[PDB]
Amino acid sequence: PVVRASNPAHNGRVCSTWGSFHYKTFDGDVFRFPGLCNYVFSEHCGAAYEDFNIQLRRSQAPTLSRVLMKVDGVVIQLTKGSVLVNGHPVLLPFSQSGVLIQQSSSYTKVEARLGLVLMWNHDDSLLLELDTKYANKTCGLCGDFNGMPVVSE
């Protein structure tokens, strides 16, 4: 299967949350939801086997307290000043099972070779970039990823 690409604008593959409970879905729908509970940021519900499952939690300033990621059997818990992999604290950079977690001067990046990139920045913004193979197969606060903003979300 040969798939061509020429347009470099790929805003449809990016979902993020920032500021005062501002959310942008993969389809471009920007809304505000001041929820402080534990919510599903994005998960692969379009297949019998789930490739990824990312959840985020907020605490009160709208700070991000916990990010839970299930990536092909790898459990990553990101908290302020702590990174846990399968319940064990790790030292960054940390590469395991096709998942690379690295901290920079402004962000914590988790890259999964199945095609996802998660960024937890220091201005309290969580940005997720997904491979185009996950289109029309996701659910959560980031939408169903089908290129249409309102329908199916």
Partner: protein, 485 residues
Amino acid sequence: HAGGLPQDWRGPDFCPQKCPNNMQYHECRSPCADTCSNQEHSRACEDHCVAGCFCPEGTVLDDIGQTGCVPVSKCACVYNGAAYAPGATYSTDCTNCTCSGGRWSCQEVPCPGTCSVLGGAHFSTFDGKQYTVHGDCSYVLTKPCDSSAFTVLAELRRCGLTDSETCLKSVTLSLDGAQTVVVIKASGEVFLNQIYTQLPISAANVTIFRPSTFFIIAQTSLGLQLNLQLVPTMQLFMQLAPKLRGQTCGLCGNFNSIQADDFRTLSGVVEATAAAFFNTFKTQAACPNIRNSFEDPCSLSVENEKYAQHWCSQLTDADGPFGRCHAAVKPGTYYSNCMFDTCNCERSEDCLCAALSSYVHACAAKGVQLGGWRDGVCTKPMTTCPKSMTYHYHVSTCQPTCRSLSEGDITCSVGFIPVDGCICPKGTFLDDTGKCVQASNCPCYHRGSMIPNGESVHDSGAICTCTHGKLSCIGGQAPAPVCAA
């Protein structure tokens, strides 16, 4: 993420961002940051520009020292896990490299080549190619293709019930169109021109000596050197001068730094298997054609495999007697040779000791000494030399003799790879009867003739008596005879 190029909008008071060291915060720069190790990472980048801390233009990150962003000219270099400095140099046996701009600039230097026949079946050519054929004939090891100035032959013969137990029984060095033939047997006997001689020999263009009871070294004036280990089994190490690169050809390759053409026969094509190329260097028609099978001797015996694994794994043990050499010589091939030889040959201890000694000799050639490696195994050869001889792990000099004391010059090649074995103890000289005696017991010599103690000689009207190993002369001395016109 839209393919745009945002311009910096922050400031000291408008959303200020801090960066480590001298890095600056930018809204759109390539995430592939150039470092000292990879100074062209930005050019080879597939991602779009991002926002973050980046080095100022003209500088790259210092990942080696973690000292912030440094200029390219100030980047260090890393070799063998040790960080160097701009302008620092290192050298190998074959090259000399210097650090500059974070990159190594290397110049080639003259470099002798080494061929090795170990265990009677394991061959390592001049270009580093390794193979294993169990021959049953006399084979041409090294020889110039267009001449016959020198020629080295090896007598690899089946020395067991099976066809995969090969012993090196003799080595033949032929010089000047077979005008000087030296045959060195596995029993230590040396035959010069079909005459059983006694070492050392200074023949035409060749000098052969015995640095110890374990080794025989033959050095020619054509740039060829032979080290022959006789204890416990006969093994060969040939060293060739760089002047013969690309000119020799035999079982040791053509010495042209290419491993691909080391299996090229005299026909002109490169063979695919070691056995096919090996069988083309036979010297006699009746010798069998060796076909390489895929046997695994260690699988044929539980006890043999256990013994081989227990005693040969010390080669690859980083914290063992041979651990100080893993950086110089890779022990994987030596470990494989040890396992195969120990599991295959009937005298397992002999083959294990041969493999360990071959690795030790390679390390000594690289300049690493592993003295005290015979504790636990291979203890027997340390307690087998004659009465007046004692063992030594490092023998980098030549055996002193009474004739060396008298004449003043010892027949030796001066410079050779250090060996091990039983030699005369320090301060003790080897007498002509194979005995180490003190300087007070070494006989006198006049005109190449032994003068027994208490005897006298007459020369130019002067009487010289041999007392206490010294040839004193009555009347003081005989300074200079003068012949009138």
